[PDB]
């Protein structure tokens, strides 16, 4: 019983660690200016019908 308790605790800890690593990577990927206005230029192929 005690070992099952410890095992579920360890599983939760491992899931938390992996998710936190993924979140840190995502936060690293999102490096940009905070809450600033942005000017965007877009060009794309546009389909046409009569």
């Amino acid at each position: 019983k005690l070992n099952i308790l410890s095992l579920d605790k360890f599983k939760e800890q491992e899931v938390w660690k992996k998710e936190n690593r993924l979140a840190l990577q995502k936060r690293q990927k999102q490096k940009f200016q905070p809450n600033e206005t942005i000017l965007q230029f877009l060009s794309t192929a546009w389909l046409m019908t009569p």
Partner: protein, 70 residues
Amino acid sequence: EGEVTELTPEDAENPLGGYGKTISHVIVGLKSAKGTKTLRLDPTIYESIQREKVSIGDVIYIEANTGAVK
């Protein structure tokens, strides 16, 4: 070539959404001697307009195929 009379960008739906304000054309109206017209230029003209600091009442020189203004 002609005096700048109108300068209005027309809003259009954003292909990428995002609730931003988008412009599909910039409208420039030029008046000349025995002539006047309104142009639906591409949105790129905004850079040249800013660089040449044109205004209403200014007479400008815009190349048809290049997109530059003066």
